[PDB]
């Protein structure tokens, strides 16, 4: 069975591998980042955690995609296998000739 | 066909089961939460809605995973079924013996 | 193979079709939107980008869903095809009659 990543942040009690998101609180210092690409500061904090979740969802979609591509290829192989369908169910015996079922009695 | 959950929040006119996200507006009071795990306050508001969407995406990925696991098991069953491939198409009749196609004429 | 959309915003160096998310920075003017449904303003900015990503994930899940629905239908068709399983492997020849394998020798 398919193993996916759990979301790293939750708005509620966390399970293994998870942390509880920290929403912006009244009373805490309201801050942003001090570099051009940093993500620190309370104003960014919960949004960063939501993005961490989004990155994991993207990876999980990729895991499903790979498995589905394999399923699609496996299906195509089965479709191309040339498996033979049932013969008539009419109390008569059949043999295989030129991609069809032919009565055994025509040869006896 | 597979039934997934619609995203509960949209940045545009909503359809059934959806609400329009409320971005932070100039003039409104800029607030956070008053408890350690609450998510209230304008500073959190749109981020909370985006997280609601993320939670639904996670569930939808799970629905696809379950369906794909069933597909994978169904494919494995077909692969293990021992279905028989076509016989030669050469104007001759064939019968089945020891997992192969053998000429009927060898028995007559 | 299945073609999905790349996420438009990343917290790191972008690849083709991507932009680097701009987190809220100390020193920049802290602003929201000036209309009831606009998303402008630094306070909304990274959250908007995360939502853009969420919208793309939703679309990608839909692409997988369509492909998986086709796989499921293709599997059902194979299951309903009436393909014939192997005959006994016992050194004897078999012919097909009434949905079963019957010994050729019973007809000779």
Swiss-Prot record, chains A, B, C:
| Full-length numbering of the shown residues | 3 to 81 of 487
Please give the superkingdom of this protein's source.
Viruses
Q: What is the lineage of its organism?
A: Viruses, Duplodnaviria, Heunggongvirae, Uroviricota, Caudoviricetes
Entry coiled-coil feature ranges: 50-79
Q: What species does this protein belong to?
A: Enterobacteria phage T4
Function as written in the Swiss-Prot or TrEMBL entry: Chaperone involved in tail fiber assembly and retraction. Acts as a chaperone helping to attach the long tail fibers to the virus during the assembly process. During phage assembly, twelve fibritin molecules attach to the phage neck via gp13: six molecules forming the collar and six molecules forming the whiskers.
* Gene, per the UniProt record: wac
PTM per Swiss-Prot/TrEMBL: Cross-linked via an isopeptide bond to E.coli host protein DncV during infection.
Q: What is this protein called?
A: Fibritin
Regarding domains, what does the record say? The central domain consists of 12 alpha-helical domains (19-40 residues long) with coiled-coil structural patterns.
Oligomeric form and interacting partners: Homotrimer. Interacts (via N-terminal domain) with neck protein gp13; this interaction allows attachment of the fibrous collar and wiskers.
Compartment(s) where it occurs, according to its Swiss-Prot or TrEMBL record: Virion
């Amino acid at each position: 069975d398919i193993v996916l990543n759990d979301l790293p942040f939750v708005d509620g009690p966390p399970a293994e591998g998870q942390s509880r998101i920290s929403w912006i609180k009244n009373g805490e210092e309201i801050l942003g980042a001090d570099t051009q690409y940093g993500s620190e500061g309370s104003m960014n904090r919960p949004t960063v955690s939501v993005l961490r979740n989004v990155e994991v969802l993207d990876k999980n979609i990729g895991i499903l995609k790979t498995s589905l591509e394999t399923a699609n290829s496996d299906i195509k192989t089965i479709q191309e296998a040339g498996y033979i369908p049932e013969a008539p169910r009419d109390g008569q015996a059949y043999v295989r000739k030129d991609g069809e079922w032919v009565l055994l009695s025509t040869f006896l």
